[PDB]
Design a protein around this ligand. Structure first.
Ligand SMILES: *[C@@H]1O[C@H](CO)[C@@H](O)[C@H](O)[C@H]1NC(C)=O
Ligand SMILES: *[C@@H]1O[C@H](CO)[C@@H](O)[C@H](O)[C@H]1NC(C)=O
Ligand SMILES: *[C@@H]1O[C@H](CO)[C@@H](O)[C@H](O)[C@H]1NC(C)=O
Ligand SMILES: *[C@@H]1O[C@H](CO)[C@@H](O)[C@H](O)[C@H]1NC(C)=O
Ligand SMILES: *[C@@H]1O[C@H](CO)[C@@H](O)[C@H](O)[C@H]1NC(C)=O
Ligand SMILES: *[C@@H]1O[C@H](CO)[C@@H](O)[C@H](O)[C@H]1NC(C)=O
Ligand SMILES: *[C@@H]1O[C@H](CO)[C@@H](O)[C@H](O)[C@H]1NC(C)=O
Ligand SMILES: *[C@@H]1O[C@H](CO)[C@@H](O)[C@H](O)[C@H]1NC(C)=O
Ligand SMILES: *[C@@H]1O[C@H](CO)[C@@H](O)[C@H](O)[C@H]1NC(C)=O
Ligand SMILES: *[C@@H]1O[C@H](CO)[C@@H](O)[C@H](O)[C@H]1NC(C)=O
Ligand SMILES: *[C@@H]1O[C@H](CO)[C@@H](O)[C@H](O)[C@H]1NC(C)=O
Ligand SMILES: *[C@@H]1O[C@H](CO)[C@@H](O)[C@H](O)[C@H]1NC(C)=O
Ligand code: NA
Ligand code: NA
Ligand code: NA
Lengths: 208, 224, 335
């Protein structure tokens, strides 16, 4: 019904956060802010109408089905989860989190096939590791026999490193042992600003 | 000054039912619609229903019809929410909200502090720990990656150190993730000199205290 | 030329001064005699904005009819918060009569003639009158009674049909007769009886209209909660307050007599305002009153678990009752 994006923004105070919502439905749309350990706060309603006590820095807009919340001169108070809302429906939320500006770092990519131990219990987990990259924006696609996957993968990211200010990320393709036996080529395609070209790490089943 | 005040947080167990309250101040109680919203980290906020204190009319979110009940004490300007047959998936912070003006319900300018409810299970389950082994080809020029897949445990959390604390530099332990199974999954990796693989033992130490479980998995390469 | 104006209206009715019935008594002193020959002039090439949901006439009718009830009904006890007033409990004669609402010197009332008017928007066909039609100030829940009918087909009205918190007002084109009485045994059990085929047919044609807004399987269902005044079809028959279970009216999916059980209650929640009142036990003898059902008040379920949409009989804010009857009208000052 209401699809919000991106999932996470990584910014510093002074920068601009652009959050979006896609809706096919008719209905006044509103934006809420939620700071850590506090009740959500109405920020925009009726698409672009600033709520009381809300600075000009906060600005809503609409282009066809796409609504946008723009926060201009970011301040520590502004960080948290933002949600769009239309009648009784909400977006998944966009997390805008404090980030430390650093030189671009390309991820080194590693893929790990299912351990034999596991396959002996009817489930196959393929794992892709993107290590020590920056900025956080990164894209990981799974391909099985070259076909795009959907739904059967989960991701997980570490916080910014206190030492090198890099992010690390894991993607895990969970398949039944059945499906795992049907296909030969497993691969994760990674894209990131620090990569001249998209990188692919792959392997053939039963063939290290 | 429209102010909504909610009851204190609660701890519950699967099967139990909960009742929270919400007292409205600074306006005509019967003249404005009321709402119950719950928020849980990582979950889409969920509207549970609205209550019109006038005659106590209601409208429950379809996925909740049967389980939820919303009432009110018109002499005490207090709204009540009851949710029964609690599962772990009912863990959230519950809020009551009102519109900015009575002519429109959905622009929630007013929220209570929110009542946090935690639903804890007596059930536990230790993780299966699978090696994520370096293979490919020395992994790279000189850097190798390896880890453990700590799968299907519950509830949270799990500890994972390497060689019992000896190895910390280069270690990344990822946020646990919930699966459709209802069980959690977690990965932990480390980078190391690809040359040392043949001579350096790597062990990961997984502790799931809820099931008092200790697993030490040696992750060795792929000597084909 | 004129501008949209807000002013006080006056009421007119054909009440009898010798009659002891409460609606008559009130209209005798709070209203003026009706003009037997109401004027209505059509206006050419004219167009006007109407919006019943922002129409001050509704608020005015509501306040009058709160006034009529407060001055007419005589509860033995009147509870509000703490400490309740006791009074004499004389039985009362109760049957609403038509009130008309009229514009005073300087103003006028515009009537929307557009066949397919929804309550909000531009009217192209607009005439001018000095008094609304005669409206029976019937207070009831779930079913609108003794009201006016849609001309050609059932009409659906809402302040915002997509807003699940906005009551949906349904207006019938053909009235369904409902007949309630307590035979002359438990002296509080009554029964209402509507023709099953006639009612089932009606519900199907409402389904047809509800699609258009939602092209799916339409479900009618019982109310999900609330005071008994809301969860039952509640209405006053000859001084006694009826509460009738409508389970058999609203329980069907779209893609012999019906016999509704009622209780007569001595203890009711006031609709005028927050409070409860207590009344004497039922007058003996045959208590009857049959009515035309001319409309229904509905609420759609929120959430998204399409396939289907579910509707339950609503009400409680009597302003919806007045709205179903005053939506064609609008007041204006004459500059
Ligand atoms: C009203 O205007 C229309 C054209 O818009 C015209 O056809 C009609 O004759 C007009 N009525 C008069 C003459 O007042
Ligand atoms: C009339 O009512 C419908 C709903 O029945 C609404 O969608 C529409 O906006 C209204 N038509 C107008 C504004 O002329
Ligand atoms: C106005 O409506 C009436 C019926 O309600 C109709 O007889 C007449 O032709 C209409 N006039 C216009 C403006 O079309
Ligand atoms: C019921 O309906 C008929 C029209 O079919 C009408 O003439 C009659 O007066 C109505 N009765 C009441 C009580 O309004
Ligand atoms: C219904 O809501 C819309 C906004 O979603 C508003 O523009 C419109 O005025 C409302 N309907 C009316 C005219 O009462
Ligand atoms: C009501 O009408 C529908 C068709 O319009 C029919 O399927 C159903 O049998 C009818 N119900 C009764 C009880 O007559
Ligand atoms: C509604 O949808 C049904 C099939 O889903 C179709 O038969 C019908 O034409 C639709 N009605 C309209 C006019 O949109
Ligand atoms: C109405 O009667 C039905 C049984 O037909 C019952 O399930 C429901 O609880 C009753 N509700 C009221 C308002 O009395
Ligand atoms: C509800 O409706 C179904 C048919 O639509 C019927 O089988 C059932 O008996 C009804 N339930 C009640 C409360 O009578
Ligand atoms: C209900 O009305 C229909 C005519 O519309 C008629 O055939 C039937 O006899 C009526 N049912 C009863 C039991 O009166
Ligand atoms: C509807 O009108 C009839 C005829 O006057 C009357 O007997 C009956 O009481 C009315 N219904 C209600 C609920 O007032
Ligand atoms: C709509 O959902 C109900 C359950 O709430 C189900 O029984 C019914 O079959 C559904 N309607 C259709 C036509 O899919
Ligand atoms: Na909205
Ligand atoms: Na009389
Ligand atoms: Na009295």
């Amino acid at each position: 019904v209401l699809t919000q994006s991106p999932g996470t923004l990584s910014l510093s105070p002074g920068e601009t956060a652009i959050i979006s919502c896609r809706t096919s439905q008719y209905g006044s749309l509103a934006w809420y802010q939620q700071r850590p350990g506090q009740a959500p706060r109405l920020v925009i309603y009726s698409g672009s109408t600033r709520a009381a006590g809300i600075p000009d820095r906060f600005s809503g807009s609409r282009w066809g089905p796409d609504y946008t919340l723009t926060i201009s001169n970011l301040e520590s108070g502004d960080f948290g989860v933002y949600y769009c809302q239309q009648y009784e429906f909400f977006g998944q939320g966009t997390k805008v989190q404090v980030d430390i500006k650093r030189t671009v770092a390309a991820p080194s990519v590693f893929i790990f096939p299912p351990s034999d131990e596991q396959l002996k219990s009817g489930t196959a987990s393929v794992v892709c590791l993107l290590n020590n990259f920056y900025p956080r924006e990164a894209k990981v696609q799974w391909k099985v026999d070259n076909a795009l996957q959907s739904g059967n993968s989960q991701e997980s990211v570490t916080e910014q490193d206190s030492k090198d200010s890099t992010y690390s990320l894991s993607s895990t393709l969970t398949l039944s042992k059945a499906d795992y036996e049907k296909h030969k080529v497993y691969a994760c395609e990674v894209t990131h600003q620090g990569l001249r070209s998209p990188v692919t790490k792959s392997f053939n089943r039963g063939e290290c | 000054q429209v102010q909504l005040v909610q009851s204190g947080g609660q701890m519950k167990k699967p099967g139990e039912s909960m009742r929270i309250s919400c007292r409205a101040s600074g306006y005509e109680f019967i003249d404005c619609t009321l709402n119950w919203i719950r928020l849980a980290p990582g979950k889409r906020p969920e509207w549970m229903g609205w209550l019109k204190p006038r005659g106590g009319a209601v409208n429950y979110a379809r996925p909740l019809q049967g389980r939820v009940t919303m009432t009110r004490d018109v002499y005490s300007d207090t709204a009540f929410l009851e949710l029964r047959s609690l599962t772990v998936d009912d863990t959230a912070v519950y809020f009551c909200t009102r519109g900015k003006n009575c002519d429109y319900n959905w622009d929630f300018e007013h929220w209570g502090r929110g009542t946090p409810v935690i639903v804890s299970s007596p059930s536990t389950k230790g993780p299966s720990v699978f090696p994520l082994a370096p293979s490919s080809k020395s992994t790279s020029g000189g850097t190798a990656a390896l880890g453990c897949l700590v799968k299907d445990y519950f509830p949270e959390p799990v500890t994972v150190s390497w060689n019992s604390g000896a190895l910390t530099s280069g270690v990344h332990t990822f946020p646990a993730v919930l699966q459709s199974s209802g069980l959690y999954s977690l990965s932990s990796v480390v980078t190391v000199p690809s040359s040392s693989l043949g001579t350096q033992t790597y062990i990961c130490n997984v502790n799931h205290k809820p099931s008092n479980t200790k697993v030490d998995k040696k992750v060795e390469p792929k000597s084909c | 030329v004129w501008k949209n104006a807000e002013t006080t209206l006056f009421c007119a009715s054909d009440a009898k001064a010798y009659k002891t019935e409460v609606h008559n008594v009130w209209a005798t002193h709070a209203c003026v005699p009706t003009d037997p020959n109401p004027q209505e002039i059509h206006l050419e090439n004219v167009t006007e904005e109407f919006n019943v949901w922002k129409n001050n006439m509704v608020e005015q009718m509501h306040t009058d009819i709160i006034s009529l009830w407060d001055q007419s009904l005589k509860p033995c006890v009147k509870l509000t918060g703490g400490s309740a007033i006791t009074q004499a409990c004389p039985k009362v004669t109760f049957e609403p009569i038509p009130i008309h609402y009229c514009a005073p010197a300087g103003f006028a009332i515009l009537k929307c003639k557009d066949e397919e008017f929804n309550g909000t928007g531009l009217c192209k066909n607009v005439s001018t009158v000095q008094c609304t039609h005669g409206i029976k100030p019937v207070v009831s829940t779930q079913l609108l009674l003794n009201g006016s009918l849609a001309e050609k087909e059932i009409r659906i009205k809402s302040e915002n049909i997509s807003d699940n918190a906005k009551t949906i007002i349904v207006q019938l084109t053909k009235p369904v007769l409902i007949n309630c009485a307590r035979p002359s045994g438990d002296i509080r059990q009554a029964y209402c009886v509507v023709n099953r085929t006639q009612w089932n047919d009606t519900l199907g044609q409402v389904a047809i209209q509800l699609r258009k807004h939602w092209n799916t399987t339409i479900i009618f269902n019982e109310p999900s909660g609330g005071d008994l005044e809301i969860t039952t079809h509640s209405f006053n028959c000859g001084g006694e307050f009826f509460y009738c279970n409508t389970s058999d009216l609203f329980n069907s999916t779209w893609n012999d007599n019906i016999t509704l059980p009622c209780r007569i209650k001595q203890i009711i929640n006031m609709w005028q305002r927050v409070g409860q009142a207590m009344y004497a036990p039922p007058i003996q003898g045959v208590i009857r009153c049959q009515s035309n059902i001319t409309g229904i008040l509905l609420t759609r379920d929120g959430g998204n678990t399409r396939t289907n949409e579910t509707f339950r009989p609503g009400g409680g804010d009597m302003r919806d009752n007045w709205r179903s009857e005053l939506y064609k009208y609008k007041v204006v000052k004459i500059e």
